[PDB]
Amino acid sequence: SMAIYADNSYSIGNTPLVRLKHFGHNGNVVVKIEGRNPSYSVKCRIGANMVWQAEKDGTLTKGKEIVEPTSGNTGIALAYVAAARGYKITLTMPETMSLERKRLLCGLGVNLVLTEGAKGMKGAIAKAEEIVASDPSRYVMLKQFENPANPQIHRETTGPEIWKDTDGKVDVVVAGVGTGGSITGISRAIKLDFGKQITSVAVEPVESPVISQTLAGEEVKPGPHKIQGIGAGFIPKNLDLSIIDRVETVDSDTALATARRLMAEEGILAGISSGAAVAAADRLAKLPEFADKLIVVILPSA
């Protein structure tokens, strides 16, 4: 009867589906704008749900401080959820952060612990572990890449929203893989709860195709790229390889060019990883196999 959220963490999701006019075949590419969220990214859903589970798990209690190594959207998602629910939070990340990002996080009240940019995510992960080890009783690390609350919340929210908003006629889901939680949880929701055998498509960088190489039985050779949000260089444990039907690779130039076309030709604001996801879905959408299929693309961030 009333729709008043008790705090900002509960306002996650219910993101919109917008049909693309200049991609795909006869309107078969439909995007889900996860930028329309608290903290302007997909990551608000797992920010909230890992905090919510840790409270019901008993692993995060009043006075306990959150510690998480993240240079990306997960830090902002956890920061605002922590402020909204009264938790202390430490974020470790390398010193390559945008300077507006630094001011944003400390504006949110984050205890920012910076590590050497040359040590990358590995240095920040190690410092986060060190901080927790220093006093395990005082801290909790949510571990976005392994925590099941990550894919669980997309099974409970992102998936059903796609099911509901397409009146069950979604046929393909195209999602870049960072933690894998999005593609994992959406697929479980639709293939298992809704029982429809859609084509689940993971997207990764041409530069670091560790999923493609793993599935083909080849040596994995991760490498650097500029598609921020995906291509971690390993198979994250929240990516369930068994529900992946296909892997598309997009290089950084194409992702950036596609993002620019999204803004100039569709009037949609989204990050480079959204461009990657749309490049992959557009490539598929002009295949006879998918000519008749409704493709839903995850746009992870603003």
Binding site: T70, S71, G72, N73, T74, G120, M121, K122, Q144, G178, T179, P222, Q228, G229, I230, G231, A232, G233
Partner: peptide, 4 residues
Amino acid sequence: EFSI
């Protein structure tokens, strides 16, 4: 090694 990413920004997630």
